[PDB]
């Protein structure tokens, strides 16, 4: 039973380690999505200007 409990604790520790990189990657992706959207909107606002 102690072995099983130790395995669980090890898994928790590994998750806590990996979330450091994981959350920051997710934040980066958030920012990337927003900037892709803004680039699309900039292109469309450029071409609406043509179109004048």
């Amino acid at each position: 039973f102690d072995r099983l409990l130790n395995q669980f604790q090890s898994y928790e520790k590994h998750l806590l380690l990996a979330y450091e990189n994981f959350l920051k990657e997710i934040e980066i992706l958030n920012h990337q999505i927003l900037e892709q959207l803004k680039s699309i909107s900039e292109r469309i606002s450029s071409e609406i200007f043509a179109s004048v």
Binding site: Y11, E27, I33, Q36, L37, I44
Partner: protein, 197 residues
């Protein structure tokens, strides 16, 4: 191409979560395989004890694994729904946004013209209007103000910690039972060893 890139990124996140669950699963199934078959060595070792241990470890998938899987599935569902929202309000409706903003500026131009009393588009205005049509206030809020992916990840982490704690409590029950047996044995031993009285 942009939409495909974002889809790939979403897939990446889901894959990472799946990998976490798979790690845990591998460990738990190895435990099950080892202890569903452990057999007593020499007589006096309580056959029933070992049998019950074997049964418990056999059921250990149900005991330790399935809730984590359910949590993973829920998180995946939420991620997929968020991607669906981003797709259908932005990365497909760009044509519609173009038509709407373009026609709005056309109507504004003609309204300007209808001032025939001798008493027209800026680029910044166009950019803001196209941004509004693409729902980028809503997606700014969902990407940065209340980051959805980050929320999902924290949900996964916090609930998996809760599950681990519950499993630990459940196992503490088993250890307590074993402790009962141990205490009985030690009582007998101390009784034997203190009969010099």
């Amino acid at each position: 191409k942009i939409k495909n890139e974002l889809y790939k990124s979403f897939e990446e996140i889901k894959m990472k979560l799946k990998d976490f669950i798979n790690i845990l699963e591998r460990e738990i199934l190895l435990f099950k395989a080892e202890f569903s078959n452990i057999q007593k060595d020499h007589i006096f070792q309580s056959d029933k004890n070992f049998s019950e241990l074997r049964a418990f470890c056999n059921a250990s998938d149900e005991y330790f694994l399935k809730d984590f899987k359910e949590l993973l599935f829920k998180s995946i569902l939420e991620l997929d729904l968020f991607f669906e929202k981003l797709n259908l309000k932005a990365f497909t409706n760009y044509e519609n946004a173009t038509k709407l903003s373009l026609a709005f500026f056309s109507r504004k131009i003609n309204e300007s013209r209808v001032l025939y009393e001798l008493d027209y588009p800026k680029k910044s205005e166009i950019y803001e209007r196209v941004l509004n049509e693409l729902n980028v206030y809503e997606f700014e809020t969902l990407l940065i103000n209340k980051p959805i992916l980050t929320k999902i990840a924290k949900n996964f982490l916090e609930q998996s910690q809760n599950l681990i704690q519950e499993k630990n409590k459940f196992l503490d029950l088993k250890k307590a039972e074993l402790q009962k047996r141990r205490a009985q044995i030690l009582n007998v031993r101390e009784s034997i060893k203190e009969d010099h009285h």
